């Protein structure tokens, strides 16, 4: 052994489950809402199913300049009106 | 007799907390429609 309490002990203790029957679902719900609110989309810049193309466009918004790439993506985004 | 907030505790949780959050996210994603 190396001093820490056995996991066998912990995960079968009543207390552990009192704590984690709260904390585990809490987190889970938080991740859920992170998606369902749409927050994720905006945090990582990921296209919603209606934001990959404009209505009549079929050209991928490929980044083509290195240093003005940011303005390029911003333009690509404004292109969806 | 036993400590609670060991190095092991930390390691365990830096892995486990994000994992449950992430699984909640992916769960949610399963009901997204085009």
């Amino acid at each position: 052994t190396t001093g820490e309490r056995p996991f066998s002990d912990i995960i079968t203790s009543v207390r552990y489950w009192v704590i984690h029957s709260i904390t585990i679902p809490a987190l889970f719900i938080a991740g859920w809402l992170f998606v369902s609110t749409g927050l994720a989309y905006d945090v990582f810049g990921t296209p919603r199913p209606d934001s990959y193309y404009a209505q009549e466009q079929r050209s991928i918004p490929l980044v083509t300049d290195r240093f003005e790439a940011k303005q390029q993506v911003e333009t690509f985004l404004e292109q969806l009106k | 007799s036993y400590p609670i907030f060991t190095v092991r505790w930390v390691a365990v949780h830096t892995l486990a907390v994000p994992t449950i959050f992430f699984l909640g996210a992916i769960a949610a994603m399963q009901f997204i429609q085009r």
Binding site: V18, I19, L33 | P3
Partner: peptide, 30 residues
């Protein structure tokens, strides 16, 4: 941004909760 408070409210409620439940043993340890 309301979505960050809505989403990361469960996490901070879990943290506050477990802090409440483990506080005496944590104080005893520290």
């Amino acid at each position: 941004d309301w979505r960050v408070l809505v989403v990361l409210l469960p996490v901070l409620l879990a943290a506050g909760w477990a802090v409440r439940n483990i506080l005496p043993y944590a104080v005893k340890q520290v």
